Design a protein around this ligand. Structure first.
Ligand SMILES: CC[C@H](C)CN(C[C@@H](O)[C@H](Cc1ccccc1)NC(=O)O[C@H]1CO[C@H]2OCC[C@H]21)S(=O)(=O)c1ccc(OC)cc1
Lengths: 99, 99
């Protein structure tokens, strides 16, 4: 599909057996999701943006379905105000910017 | 152009007659540039990101050319980690997401 940017580009995603809303975010290197109690091992990470850094948990090889398109890769979990789908998964669903 | 997302979508912009590099950021409502001198009046404002809130100077109705496309809109100037072009200007240049 084609998504205009008059409003936030929120889409439904499926991860860890849950449905959530997340931003298709070309400005995010990585995917960062609201706190959720995923199983398995993880490693600590800090990521920075406007306002400074937050501590997150990095999970690898996570299955995630974005608007019907399947992907698998690294997801960071922590106290983010918003779920963001980053470039690491946007590439996997064939997402481009166009103007 | 069509921009893939294996790398950061960095483009050259022109603002205040000066060239800069900036990130096309669909997860940003607003455009936030690193500290710089701009002509005209401004007003102090706050904006929040993943790590908290920062103080910025708001410049309204600023001419800015993004990868050869012209926009006129609000630009926030302050201690952002990188220059980001947000939806307020991405809409003006006709930018959409496509997958
Ligand atoms: C360094 C570039 C950029 C600031 C990075 N951000 C992605 C943005 O899309 C961020 C994503 C974001 C969106 C909403 C709330 C928190 C973060 N948007 C944002 O901060 O936008 C601000 C400017 O306009 C306003 O509209 C939203 C907040 C304001 S981020 O969330 O902090 C981020 C995401 C993934 C990362 O992996 C390394 C590292 C940082």
């Amino acid at each position: 599909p084609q998504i205009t940017l008059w409003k936030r580009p929120l889409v439904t995603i499926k991860i860890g057996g849950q449905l959530k809303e997340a931003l298709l975010d070309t400005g995010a290197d990585d995917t960062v999701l609201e706190e959720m109690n995923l199983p398995g091992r993880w490693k600590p990470k800090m990521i920075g943006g406007i306002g400074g850094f937050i501590k997150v948990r990095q999970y690898d090889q996570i299955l995630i379905e974005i608007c019907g398109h399947k992907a698998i890769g690294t997801v960071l979990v922590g106290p983010t105000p918003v779920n963001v789908i980053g470039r690491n998964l946007l590439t996997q669903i064939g997402c481009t910017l166009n103007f």
